Amino acid sequence: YKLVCYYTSWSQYREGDGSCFPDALDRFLCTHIIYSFANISNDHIDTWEWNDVTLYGMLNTLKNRNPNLKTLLSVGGWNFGSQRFSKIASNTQSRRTFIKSVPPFLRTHGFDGLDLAWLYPGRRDKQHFTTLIKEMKAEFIKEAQPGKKQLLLSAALSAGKVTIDSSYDIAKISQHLDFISIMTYDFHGAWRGTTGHHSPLFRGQEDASPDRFSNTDYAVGYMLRLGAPASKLVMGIPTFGRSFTLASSETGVGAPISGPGIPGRFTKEAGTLAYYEICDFLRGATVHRILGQQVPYATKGNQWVGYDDQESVKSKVQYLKDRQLAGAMVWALDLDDFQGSFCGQDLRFPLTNAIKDALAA
Amino acid sequence: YKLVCYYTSWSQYREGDGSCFPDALDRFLCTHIIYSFANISNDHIDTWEWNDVTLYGMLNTLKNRNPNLKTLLSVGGWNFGSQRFSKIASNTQSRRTFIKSVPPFLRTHGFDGLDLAWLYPGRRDKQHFTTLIKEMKAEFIKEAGKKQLLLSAALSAGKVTIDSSYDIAKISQHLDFISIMTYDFHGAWRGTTGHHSPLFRGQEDASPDRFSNTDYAVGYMLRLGAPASKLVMGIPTFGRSFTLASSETGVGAPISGPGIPGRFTKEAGTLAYYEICDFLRGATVHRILGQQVPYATKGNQWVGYDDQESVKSKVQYLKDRQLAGAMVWALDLDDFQGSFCGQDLRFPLTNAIKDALAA
Amino acid sequence: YKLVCYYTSWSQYREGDGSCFPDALDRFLCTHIIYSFANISNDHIDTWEWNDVTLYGMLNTLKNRNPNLKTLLSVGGWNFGSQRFSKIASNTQSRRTFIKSVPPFLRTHGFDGLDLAWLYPGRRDKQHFTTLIKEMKAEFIKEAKKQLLLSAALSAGKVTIDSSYDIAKISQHLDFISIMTYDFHGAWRGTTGHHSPLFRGQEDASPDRFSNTDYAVGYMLRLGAPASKLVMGIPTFGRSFTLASSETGVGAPISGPGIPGRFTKEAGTLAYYEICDFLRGATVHRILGQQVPYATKGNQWVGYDDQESVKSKVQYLKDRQLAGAMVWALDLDDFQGSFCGQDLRFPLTNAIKDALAA
Amino acid sequence: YKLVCYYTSWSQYREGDGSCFPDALDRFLCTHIIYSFANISNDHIDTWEWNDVTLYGMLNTLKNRNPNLKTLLSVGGWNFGSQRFSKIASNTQSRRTFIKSVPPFLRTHGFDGLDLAWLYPGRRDKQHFTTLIKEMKAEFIKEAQPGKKQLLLSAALSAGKVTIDSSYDIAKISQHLDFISIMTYDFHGAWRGTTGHHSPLFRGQEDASPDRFSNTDYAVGYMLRLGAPASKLVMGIPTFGRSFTLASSETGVGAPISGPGIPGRFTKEAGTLAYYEICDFLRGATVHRILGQQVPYATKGNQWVGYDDQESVKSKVQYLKDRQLAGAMVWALDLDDFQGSFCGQDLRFPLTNAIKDALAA
Ligand SMILES: *[C@@H]1O[C@H](CO)[C@@H](O[C@@H]2O[C@H](CO)[C@@H](O)[C@H](O)[C@H]2NC(C)=O)[C@H](O)[C@H]1NC(C)=O
Ligand SMILES: *[C@@H]1O[C@H](CO)[C@@H](O[C@@H]2O[C@H](CO)[C@@H](O)[C@H](O)[C@H]2NC(C)=O)[C@H](O)[C@H]1NC(C)=O
Ligand SMILES: *[C@@H]1O[C@H](CO)[C@@H](O[C@@H]2O[C@H](CO)[C@@H](O)[C@H](O)[C@H]2NC(C)=O)[C@H](O)[C@H]1NC(C)=O
Ligand SMILES: *[C@@H]1O[C@H](CO)[C@@H](O[C@@H]2O[C@H](CO)[C@@H](O)[C@H](O)[C@H]2NC(C)=O)[C@H](O)[C@H]1NC(C)=O
């Protein structure tokens, strides 16, 4: 199995113990570490953060003691602009320049491949996305034709049915990608204004959800039916939680909310909490396992958070193994307790290690 | 919460330690114990087993030490005959006679209610079923300075049967409680393994419909108008077994037929919890993701059953839904002797249900 | 069948022939006419427009030639304030004051009932709304001269219904419910879609199965509303968009709301009389599974209702045995009779009236 | 557009004016006529009816005056045995023998192609079905390599979501099939105990529908979403009706029934009526058009029949043209008023002609 883990470069800026640089990562933890994100400027792949070159080096040094470890650079991301990516992919020239720029940039900076993170192509971009992937793969084959280790090509795809139907021609792109990381988290499955877990394994209570597809199981089954080979599908597992501010004494799934949860001390984004911030939150909280969904939520005062713990990530791994998938993808290393100090057991990357352990069991 | 438990009169005939008589039951276990089954001959409610009157007494004796414990007799069952029950229900005369014969027969033998177990009304019987229930409740009402006789019904949890034969919104007005039989589901693809009592659907592309599970049935009855306060969720103490046809042993694996009969229950395809505890020695147990229930497999045998862990999840579910309580099928299929499941505790599953309801 | 029709007071301000006053309304057209909207000040129902009293007068004057015509006053509206209405209804004292204030105000001004238009109660207001309606009806029974009528305009949106209304309870006390089956979010984000389809139609051409008239009516019926108390909303206006490409079908990309109408001046909306003008040189397409039309011309697209579609909607409500139809709104139909090419006033409302009687 | 029409060889046996042989067919009516069904014996495609060779000849004679008309032979059918077809398709040797036997049988008998009508592959047959289709197409390509007109390969597929999910890998088989005829009819079995139209265009009144997928629109949309190109999808339109015996004075959609309708004089099958039988039934009956489903039903006394008429097949064609599908498929020519004498208009094939005209408009 593959254990693909994302490292986000903006996590270096979090205050104090929240600051995460590549040298804080365990070189033997993942099979593939993906650095996010690279920019596309003047149609050439390029760095994003001022010190990306330094951080690329910190990341690639992990391979010194672990030859098996592969690294990839992810281009795009949420702050890129779906519109701007679209412009680059639809223009014959821009697309060629972009593709031509990638292999030298990866060889020059020590990466083993590229991860495409166009988040997300819209209706009107389905064929351009397919074309971009086919051409990018063709370039990697050409670059390596004279005996080199061929560069890997992956893509982070939405797990949302609406986006999959409008933007991806799954059977076609699957033939060219080395693997697909399906982003099975950040689901918007709760009725507007109510609590709901953002990464349930299954739909759960039948009459309590807006739809049948805002869950991991549905998304995975859908992509498999559309033609993604199980051997190329890597299932996303989050290390973060999605939070809400409760509007009443009700605390179950579907309880009324007044908005996103209070921002965490380190991540500072209303509605999200890193696993290490959740560990702090859990002191004084009550944890409840959602019966039909195989995942927990915790609640304390007027706050409620749906997240994943060691027990739930092991269940998600059991699921992906039962389905013979390629492995797990983790978003993200800097959101797991990478310091090993917040979740009272003195062990770094508790969630990611739980996933690694389950894949090996 | 109500903890409604069924006792089956034909369990007495079971070999050795399998034999179960009402005196072997724990008087403080359930809130309601239901005796199954009564017959209908010449349109009058009548005993089924030769020694039925003897068993009725053993059962009600349990009430001497427990003031609160309640008992009911269940008329119908799988061997009664839907064909027969229909004729009795449809026919105006036969219906009045039957109804009339009920209160007396109960009082005499000392029961506190009637449980209708018509399995199951056909499409042409939906109205007859509603009338029978309304009129039966009527006769119970026109009788008190005593305690009013309770009226309950055991209903299919199967969507097709519910749609074709029950007028839920109407019959629920008159029933004191509905016991939904959320087990013995036939949700697996034909010729394959599947759990007969999953709490949820589980993997979406691994079953034909999303209807064959406890959650769907409970939600559908609440959707059809059944008040939560009158709904008691069925939890089985038995497992449903199969004979595997290949090396595959997961959910959905091919089968050649029902599992080998249990040493005591001797019914291919079914195993009492105490027989499962024996089967578990040397077996591999897997908890089904999303369904919240276990299956065990050993050699060419495979069985989907309920254990302390799963009945507790089922109780947690019913309490979150604010249902009336739990129904157990059946006391005689739990480890009532207390000596088969290595703990040396009688009624391990029913007790687990009792403790979870109180939790 | 009831034919409940809204008249909006702000329509008096529209320019030229768009100006609409109660005295422009045909007194035999509707069975009930609701005046929108009244305010609530210092916890007492009160007037909104500076000339409301004069307008109340013109309305009720319609009852002279037609004795069986009823009129109601709607309180609330979109400009009222969901939070405000909440403050009033969730405080025992304010609630009592408001309810007490209602009967006399209605009697004094010639109204036969009150229409509650709290748009809309939030999740924390479901019980409060039920209590407000129950106590308001009790006051009406107590005060009864013909008992005053109490109706309510309810959202047709599943989420709002689930969060805001205890349908079984409030429907026992209301004389009728007008379900607002229009202004649905009938389109995938950033694309065209009809705002008032009768059925869902092509399943992949609309975001969900709830945003249509049929779903909302079946839902309210399932939740306990007696069919005999449910009045189905039919719009006489259209919802428009500005196209972003050469595609013009349902689901085509848009860049924003449609160009405002000359008279209604509201981006994204068009009165039927404005649409009749728009139709000259336009192409009309009947949406197959939705039983309603859209028209397109140049970079504009509008989903609306016409005589054929309002007649299908009436056929549907009659088949469902509903209490009747609600029309929003008289001032948006061609009340002048001059814009649609056949010198006949209220073409749409008259089409509904004819369908109800047929 | 394509107008694919089925001729069933058992219709020759119907009493009197119901007997239909290929020489009663209009050579200019359809673009493709499919003869149903051929057998597979000793693993070789073979005839089924005693006089099939004669009837093949009558059918192909129709191309004499119409060079554009194509004919295909359908193998399988309801009386074949899905398990028998499965044994053939799963065994390597049996499969090869069958595939090898097809081109020579088609050339010898004057057919332009083969229609696969395995009704239906089981859960364990999905991959075997894909392989059968791929190898068959490969044999057709090989047979024509030396410059011949390549033989056509089509498949009649279930429109039932449950069957599609268990039996077909849509994305893959649609790559090798020249066209797919989706059997969008026979959606409301009498087992449900209520009246329901068997071929509605849309779901319609939501609370009157058993589910979301038993309608033409869902099945078409679903196959498109699963990867079948619109240009290879031919939508089935029935010329027959599905009938029921009413159990009460209620006659609308969802009314209680006691079972299938009384058999027609010529088709002699409870629950089905050919369009020419429906025309006789309509005298004295009341026709109701189902608002949200765009199709009619007729009722008279204790009988109720859901069917298609000139107005509804016209709407179905409008629908398929709007979706840019390849065309329409008609089941079946012998069930339309082929004599032209039952529907009081003196014109043959009224329903098939209304479809032809709508496709051309
Ligand atoms: C990523 O690359 C794009 C280049 O396309 C950068 O965007 C430009 O930024 C400059 C400086 O503010 C602007 O003047 C241009 O208008 C931008 N171009 C476009 C087309 O938007 C962007 O700043 C880069 N991001 C980073 C962090 O390097
Ligand atoms: C339940 O009652 C039925 C009917 O009263 C009993 O069935 C009858 O059995 C006798 C034999 O003892 C047959 O001759 C009759 O034909 C049966 N009646 C019919 C027509 O069904 C049945 O035996 C009773 N069950 C018990 C054992 O209590
Ligand atoms: C409806 O009634 C409210 C009173 O609740 C009016 O709002 C008041 O407006 C005045 C000045 O315009 C303010 O000084 C008050 O504070 C407002 N009341 C509050 C606290 O909400 C509103 O203007 C009335 N609407 C109309 C058009 O008459
Ligand atoms: C279609 O071909 C099958 C061959 O498999 C025929 O089935 C055989 O029928 C004979 C009777 O003539 C039986 O003795 C065999 O046992 C059957 N074989 C199998 C494998 O089923 C069938 O008769 C043919 N049908 C027609 C109408 O020609």
Is the Cβ–Cβ distance between D138 and D165 less than 8 Å? no
- From A206, A291, A318, residue closest to B316, measured CB to CB: A291
Q: What is the 3-state secondary structure (H, E, C) of D238-293?
A: ECEEEEEEECCCCCCCCCEEEEECCCCCCCCCCCEEEHHHHHHHCCCCEEEEECCC
What is the amino acid identity at position A85?
Answer: F
Q: What CATH architecture applies to the domain B237-306?
A: Roll (3.10)
Give DSSP secondary structure letters for B92-114: HHHHHHHHHHHHHHHHHHT-SEE
Q: Which of D82, D86, D123, D161 to mutate to test the interface with B (most CBs of B within 10 A)?
A: D123
Q: Count each helix (H run) and each strand (E run) in chain D, helices first.
A: 10, 15
Fold of B1-236+307-359: TIM Barrel (3.20.20)
Tokens, residue B80: 């009664």
Contact: B164, D193; criterion CB under 8 Å:
yes
SS3 of residue B263 by DSSP = coil
| Cβ of A80 below 6 Å from ligand 1 | no
Centre of ligand 4 to C-alpha D250, Å, is 46
Q: Does A218 touch chain B (CB under 8 A)?
A: yes
Q: Is A76 exposed, middle or buried (0-12, 13-18, 19+ CB in 10 A)?
A: buried
B-contacting chains (≥3 CB pairs under 8 Å): A, D
- Contacts of residue B83, defined as CB under 8 A and 6 or more positions apart, other chains included, come to none
Q: Are strands B293-298 and B284-288 parallel, antiparallel or unpaired?
A: antiparallel
Closest CA to C330 of C354, C317, C348: C348
Residue whose tokens read 């009688």: B346
What residues form DSSP beta bridges with B33? B5, B71
CB of C20 closer than 8 Å to CB of C11: yes
Q: Tell me the C-alpha distance between B109 and C123, whole Å.
A: 53
The alpha carbon of residue C23 is apart from the nearest alpha carbon of chain A, in Å, by 43
Kindly state the tokens that stand for A157.
């795809």
One-letter amino acid of C303: G
Phi-psi region of D55 (alpha: psi -120 to 50; beta: other; left: phi over 0): alpha
Residues found in chain A: 361
Residue with tokens 């408009």: D361
What would you measure as the largest C-alpha separation in chain A, in angstroms?
Answer: 67
Closest Cα partner for B180 from B154, B161, B158, B162? B154
What residues in D contact A222, CB-CB < 8 Å?
none
How is chain C split into domains, by residue range? 1-235+306-358, 236-305
Provide the CATH number for the domain formed by A239-308 in this structure.
3.10.50.10
CA distance C181 to A291: 37
Q: Judge residue B239's burial from the number of C-beta atoms within 10 Å of its C-beta, 0-12 exposed, 13-18 middle, 19 or more buried.
A: buried
Report residue D147 as tokens: 């410059």
Ligand nearest to the CA of A46: 1
Rounded to the nearest whole angstrom, what is the distance from the C-alpha of residue D42 to the centroid of ligand 4?
A: 9
The closest of B55, B37, B193 to B115, measured between CA atoms, is: B37
Q: Are B271 and B265 in contact (CB under 8 A)?
A: yes
Contact, B162 vs B168, CB < 8 A?
yes
Q: For an interface test with D, give the residue of C181, C188, C198, C204 to mutate (most D CBs within 10 A).
A: C204
The helix (H) or strand (E) run that includes residue B56 is helix B52-61
Bridge-based pairing state of the strands D286-290 and D295-300:
antiparallel
The one-character DSSP state at C124 is: G
Structure token digits, residue C358: 């047929």
User: What are the angstrom distances between the C-alpha of D22 and each of A63, A299, B98, D352?
Assistant: 74, 74, 64, 15
Q: Using CB atoms, which chains have 3+ pairs under 8 A with D?
A: A, B, C
Q: Cα–Cα distance between D226 and A231 in angstroms, integer?
A: 19
The nearest alpha carbon in chain D to B189 belongs to D123
CA–CA gap between residue B37 and residue B55 (Å, rounded): 12
Is A353 labelled a binding residue?
Answer: no
d(CA C17, CA C8): 16
Count the helices and strands in chain C (H runs, E runs): 10, 15
**Are B189 and D123 in contact (CB < 8 Å)?**
yes
Give Cα D311 to chain centroid, integer Å. 19
Q: Resolution in A for the shown PDB structure?
A: 1.9
Q: Residue for token digits 């009033």?
A: C88
- Which secondary-structure segment (H or E) carries C77? strand C70-77
Nearest CA to ligand 4 atom 2: D41
What tokens does A32 get? 């593939």
Q: What is the rounded radius of gyration, in angstroms, for the C-alpha atoms of chain D?
A: 20
Helix (H) or strand (E) holding B231: strand B231-236
The CATH code belonging to domain C1-235+306-358 is 3.20.20.80
Residue contact B215–A221, C-beta within 8 A: no
Judged by DSSP in three states, D311 sits in helix
CB contact under 8 A, C204 and A165: yes
Q: What is each CA distance from D119 to A297, D74, D186, D234, in whole angstroms?
A: 47, 11, 13, 18
Residue C52 assigned ligand-binding role: no
Whether residue B356 contacts residue B309, with contact meaning beta carbons closer than 8 Å, is answered with: no
**Is the C-beta atom of A41 inside 6 A of ligand 1?**
yes
Going by their DSSP bridges, the two strands B239-244 and B255-258 should be labelled as antiparallel
Cα-to-chain-centroid distance, residue D351: 14
Q: Establish if C319 touches chain D: CB-CB under 8 angstroms.
A: yes
- Strand pairing of C230-235 and C176-180? parallel
Q: For ligand 3, which residues put their CB under 6 angstroms from it?
A: C 39, 41, 48
User: Which one-letter DSSP state was computed for residue D115?
Assistant: E
Provide the 8-state DSSP code for B343. Answer: S
Cβ(B247)–Cβ(B222) below 8 Å:
no
Contacts of C294 (CB under 8 A, 6+ apart): C192, C194, C250, C284, C285, C287, C301, C302, C303, C304
Residue A179, min C-alpha distance to chain D (Å): 19
CB B331 within 8 A of CB B347: yes
Q: Is D32 on the interface with C (CB under 8 A)?
A: no
| Residue carrying structure tokens 């004979």 | B243
Q: Element (H or E) spanning B271, and its range?
A: strand B270-271
DSSP D69: -
Distance (Å, rounded) from C-alpha A237 to C-alpha A214? 14
Experimental determination approach used? X-ray
For residue D317, give how far its alpha carbon lies from the nearest alpha carbon of chain C (Å). Answer: 11
To the question of domain D1-238+309-361 being in CATH 3.20.20.80, the answer is: yes
Q: Do domains A1-238+309-361 and A239-308 have the same CATH topology?
A: no
The CATH classification number of C236-305 equals 3.10.50.10
Q: Which of A240, A53, A75 is nearest to A155 (CA)?
A: A75
HSE-CB at C162 with a 13 A cutoff on CA atoms is 16
Q: CA A296 to CA A304: how far, in whole Å?
A: 11
